[PDB]
Structure formats: structure tokens, C-alpha cells
Assembly symmetry: D4
């Protein structure tokens, strides 16, 4: 299926299992993929046949910046649920939530979770 992507959104948030993380905050990154037909939009040049990617950005920002969860899994799950609830034309989405600066002693680029969700 055709795809809309938003790559490497960066937010500052307060999610985390440790209370110290909830106090200090840290970077969170999100990669978004949504699956939908884009042919009608590409033939007509009419945005009403697609999904406004500015709205998709704001949907992600709300989950990461305006809420606080323990788990990155909860960020991913809530983004996916909100997308499918709000956009009937999107059949499936893949949400990757990245924690690049976790409190793990060691050397690495990032930890992340990734889920793919569709309706029943």
C-alpha cells in the first residue's frame, strides 16, 4: 500500500519507569508510517483524498509532550490508536518510538519500540 512518512520527529518528554526520569525528562524521537491509497490524491491533486501530514505531526506531539507514561510502549500504542480512530482512510500504521538517551550505563545509539496496528 502507498505510504505517508514523517521521519525523526524530536520531542522533549518526561516518560520513564524511574521517577528521576519523570522529573528530568529527555529526548524522544518518533518515526511514523501510515498506509492508505494515494492514487486518487496523486491523480486529482486534491488534499481531501489524502491525510494532512501536519495533522499527523500534531497527533504525535500531543501523545509525547502532553502526556507522561512509564513505558515507550504506551507512547507507541496511543499514537497508533489515535491515528486509526481519527483517519478512517488509513488502513494500517507503523509507529517507532525511540529513546536515544536512556539511563543505561553503556555505549549505544538508541533503544526503541516499534508496533504495527490495523483495525479488526
Amino acid at each position: 500500500m502507498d505510504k505517508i512518512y514523517i521521519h525523526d520527529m524530536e520531542f522533549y518528554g518526561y516518560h520513564g519507569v524511574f521517577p528521576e526520569e519523570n522529573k528530568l525528562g529527555q529526548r524522544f524521537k518518533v518515526d511514523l508510517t501510515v498506509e492508505l491509497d494515494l492514487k486518487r490524491a496523486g491523480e486529482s491533486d486534491d488534499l481531501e483524498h489524502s491525510v494532512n501530514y501536519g495533522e499527523l505531526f500534531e497527533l504525535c506531539r500531543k501523545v509525547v509532550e502532553d502526556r507522561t507514561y512509564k513505558l515507550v510502549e504506551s507512547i507507541a500504542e496511543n499514537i497508533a490508536t489515535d491515528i486509526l480512530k481519527q483517519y478512517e482512510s488509513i488502513s494500517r500504521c507503523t509507529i517507532k518510538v525511540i529513546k536515544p538517551d536512556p539511563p543505561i550505563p553503556g555505549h549505544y545509539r538508541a533503544v526503541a519500540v516499534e508496533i504495527t496496528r490495523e483495525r479488526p
Copy 2:
């Protein structure tokens, strides 16, 4: 199937939903993948058994620089249509059109659309 790629073509264009975007312009990037047999070319060293990637670059440039659409979907769709019309030996293509600097308040690397097209 075997593939020809052109990675991260960069164009300056005027596409966009907002009239201000049509006035100012911005960067657009394109990733191209085309699927075709390359074995006859790889065995013969004869370009007539493949597709000249310089021509593929120019085909993309024409759509992005010489036309102006509202939607990135229209850029992708027109590139794919032109490829399949001009190159009978290409069975399928995947076109990703990237808008790295959209007028979205926030922090991210890029927004993009991606389509895969083949003939009926």
C-alpha cells in the same frame, strides 16, 4: 526483481498547498527504484538491455522543477506514470518524494510520500 536506484536527488521546486509555498519554493528530494531484468545487460555489457539512469534522472527533474502541484502525491504519481509510459522494460517502480523543510512548526527530519506502481 533486479533494481536500478537513484538515491536522494535534490531539486528546488514550488509545490505546496499554501500559496506562500508556491511563491517561495523549497527543497524537494526524490528516491527512485525501478524493477527490471538486468541479467541480459550484466552478461552482454550492452546498455540497450537496461535503462539509462541519466534519462531516469532527467524524467524526475522535469516533474519536480518544470511543473507545480499542490501535493507531493502528485509529484510521485506523475513520475511513476512517466516511467511506466516511457520504459516498457520496467515492470514496477517505487517513488519516494521527500519534503525536508515543510512549513510545519516543530522538529523533524522530513515528511514524505511513497508509492509503488505497475501496469494493469
Copy 3:
């Protein structure tokens, strides 16, 4: 002289000569360097003998996000003025304001202004 740096701050702002830029906005980046004696702080481990770099970040954010100028020159000048007014222990500063996505048809990484300021 010793230095505090903040590298590659990224803000979304509305500065620009063209009215279309003031409507759409774009990325702005800032590099900050301030010059001050750090030896008293490095020997005592007491932040009172240095300058809190979180405050320096917020000072830059206010100029870039909470105001709108025509010129990147005005962003740099106002950041430098605010630093010298507020931190008597800083003797000089260098402020670089970067516009990575200006409305210039062409291929480049960024345009920028850089100033160094001290008191009379």
C-alpha cells in the same frame, strides 16, 4: 579565555524579509559561545562561580521564538545584547544564527551570520 558552548540549538521561527516567510516560518539554528573565567568554578564545583547554561539556552529561545525580525542579523544582535546585559561575568560572546532552509533557489547547506560582541 575559557568558554561555555551551546551547539546547534534548533528553533522554529518566523523571521524573514519576505512576508511569506513571516507567514510560513522555517527552521533557525543558533550556535552560542560565551567567554568567562571558569577556574573558580572548576576548583570549587560551585555553579555560582559560573553561568548556568540552561539559562543561556532559554535566553536564545526567547529571541528566536518569541520575537519576529526581518533579518537574522537582528536575532544575533539581540542575543548578544541580552547576554552581556544579564551576565556581568561574561566578557565576550560569539553568536552564530543559521538559516538552513532559506527561500534561495539553489543547492547549499545553509546561510548564516556570526557576530562577536563585548562591552565598551
Copy 4:
């Protein structure tokens, strides 16, 4: 299936076919992917429904830093075996072990092995 990732872990280790490599050591990098249901965790915000990625990091560190094998294949195989033994909720994993600085005269970014493992 949903995934947890740890990207680009960097370790210093002593693995290698040549005895000189066992003496000098070199960088080793690991990419980890584990497959498991994350929906129960994303709905409950309860870490007991997922796998702690700090533990996954430490499991990898033990294999790369606390043991010495001739082959990168042995690093990958032991990481995969340990994951599946310790985490019943993980159904499959993909482990990539990267040797970026091998003693190969030439110019390249890295050599690597990658395996995917599941239970019988």
C-alpha cells in the same frame, strides 16, 4: 510482530581468528531486534508485560566483553541463544554483529554477520 530494538551498541572485545586480534582487541558493534507482543504493555503501561531493554543490553555486553571467540558468528549465536533461554515471551530475535575495523587491507565501512533465531 511488535519489536524492541537496541541500535548500534559499541563494545571493545578480543574476538578474532588471528592471535594478534586476541591480544590487541578492537571495536565490536551489535544491533538487536527482539519480537514479542507489546500490546498488553502498551495498554497497561506495565513493564511486566514487556522485556526490560536494560537487561537486553547487559546480556549482549556479557557475550561481547566477558567472553572471547574466534568468530563473530559465535558472538551472534550466543546472544540469540541467551535471549531465547531467558525470555519466554520473546518468540524470535535478529542479532547483527558488526566488526567495523577488521584486519582486512582495503577500504570499507564494516563486515558483519546477521542471524534470526526462534525456538523449535
Copy 5:
């Protein structure tokens, strides 16, 4: 199937359709993937159960540096053929040949061909 990778080999070669390219030369890059069982190697720590990646590097170097073809397709095809001829334990390979600096007026990262080959 398990994989051995060699990422981003860089060679200087003389391949090209235009005689001027055959005179001047340019960079060529190769990504190699070979598919084979690695479990016996990962369990035994015995290199005789795998394929020496230094030999794979040299096989690629020979094709790119010691021969001159018109087409990048010929580079890819000859590398794949040599791999399958020399290593009975490799069941399939994917060879990507990248020309990052072709004589195409325009702005892009690279052009490339990619083939996957197995025995009849």
C-alpha cells in the same frame, strides 16, 4: 537465511559507457550480502563452517579494480557469478554496485544497480 555482509567497500575503477570515464576513472562502491547457514559456525567457533569475509572482499576488489566494463550491471553480475562459483555453501547473494560520482549534471547522492542471484 543467515547472512554475511560487507558494507560500503570503496574502490577506484575505470568502468563507464563514455570513453572519458574509462580514462579518468571514479569511485565505485559495493555492498555485499551472502546467504548461508551460520548455525554450525556459531555453535563450533570453526571458520570452516562459514565463508572467510576477507576472501569475499578480495573477490569484489578483483572485479572492480582489475577489470573494466561499460556497465555497472556487468560489475554486479560478475561478482555474483564468482561468489556462487567459488562458494558452494552460499545459496544466494545480493550485490549492490554504487556509482556515487557519475557524469550526470544535477544533484543527487548516487546511482546504483542491485541484483539477487541463486543457482538453477
Copy 6:
């Protein structure tokens, strides 16, 4: 002195000592630095008290794309001469001309020339 920068302009051009380079062309990059007082502009927000960096970009583009020289030295020298002739308020400039893909068999990022010029 205060500075305006344009970083990493990329042009496709035909400069070079070898006739084959003049036929095929290649990438050329330019870094520009100009020195001028920016305080009047930063205090007034009036572009008339600075130098329009879009004009500086076009000045460089003309030299690199609309002319063909043997030497990168000639590109740099002509850019600097044109800047000083056209902008009396610029007291000095530093021009770096980069050839990232020269016909040199070997492994490197780029070759370059850099000059600093002012009036007698």
C-alpha cells in the same frame, strides 16, 4: 569583524586541467565567508545596511556554472574579485573551492583551495 557565511554550495561544473573533465563535468562545492560590519543592520533590522546573501549565492553560481576554467584556483580568485568589486561594504572575504570527486586514484574526501582577499 562580523561575518556572513554560505556553507557548502553545490554546483555541477566543467572545470579541470584534463579535457576529459571539461567534457564530463563533476561536482564543485564552495564555502563563502565575507567580513563586514553587521551592527547597523542588527540594530535597525534594515537589509540596506547589510549584504543580501541571496545575491552572494548567485554571484558564486555564475562563476562556477556559467564559466569553465582549468584550475579551481581561478574559480576562487574570480569569486573573490567579483565580491570585492560589487560590495564596497565587504572589507575581506575567504573563498574555499572544493572538488570532492577529482580524477585522482585513491581514497579521500576532497581536495580544495582556499584564499583570503582584500583591497589594496
Copy 7:
């Protein structure tokens, strides 16, 4: 004067003003420059006429990993003091201590302090 550099050392440490930082830890990076005559070493090929850069690395690691300070200023100051105390042949050093993931809500690459020290 001639220089030895160590670029972008990465350590995990517990420094910081906030108690939560001392509990969680974070990445710290260090750039080291030391100034000394290298001509005797370059003519003789005898390490006794230079300074072993592996020892310089370990000196930095001890300060960043084996101690905990409130300020990055204290890390830099102690590294510089230890270098000058231990290596009479080094006449001056520049130490840059980088905190890439501080608890500052915002978007940036890093904050840092940099000092240059010599003997009275």
C-alpha cells in the same frame, strides 16, 4: 606548537547539579588537545620522546568515570591539572567536556565547557 589529539571520547558518568542526574547518569564526551614538541619523536621514531596517547585516554577516563562532580567545569579542570602534573613535556592543554544529553527542555546538539591551561 605540535599537538596530540584524542577526539570524541565517550564515557558514561554521573556528574550533575541535580541529584536526579547523579542517580541516573548520562553520556559525557571529551575532546583533548595537548601541546608539545613532536620533532624529536618524529625524527627518532622513539615513543620515549613523545607522550603515549593511551595513557592520556586513561587519565581522562579516570576523571569522568571514577569521580562524580556537580559541574562539567570540574571535570575539565581536573583533567587539565592531571595532565600538566604528570607530563612535564606538555606545555599547554585544551580540554573540552561535552554534555550531549543534559536535562534541558529544548532542541540542541550539546552543551560544553572548554578550558586551556598551562603552568605559571
Copy 8:
């Protein structure tokens, strides 16, 4: 003074204090800067009034690939000596020799030496 640069030359070499390094080899990188008047060349377009940067590359390659020293200091010193001996028009040079993959247990980008040399 005007400059010619060659950035990030990469060679495979066998230099090192430990005998194991002389057996295995590793990457070495070199940055070259030479200072000379470029105005005569930039005005005349005649390479005879400059220094051929392809010759400078080969001069560096000979030292790094065709000789083996214990110290990176010796690589830098010999490159600088050869440049000044062979090019009377070069008045000064700065040579940086980088060892990105030394046998130092730890996490860093590279170690390096840098020297600046001129004639008596």
C-alpha cells in the same frame, strides 16, 4: 597565506609500536594543508604557478603505504619533510595523521598527531 587542502585521505598501513599492529595493519587517515601564493595561478589559470594536488596525494600515500614506522609522529614528520624538500613554492605545511582504530580499550572517534613545519 592561500592554502591547498586534501581532506581525509584514507590508507591501510602497518605502523605501530606493538608488533601485533605491524602484522595486522589498520586504517590511517591524513589531512594535508600547504601554504603558498595562489594569486598568480588564479589570475593565469596556469597550473605551473601552483602545485598539482594529485602529486601531493601521492607523496602522502608513499609515506603511509610504502613505509612502516612505530609512531604516527614519524608519518607526519616524513610527509612534511618531503613536501618542503620537493616544493620550493610551499612556505609552510600542516600535516595531521589520524589513527581512528588504535588498540586502546575504550570509546572514542580517533587519536591523532598534528605538526606545522617550515624551512629555517
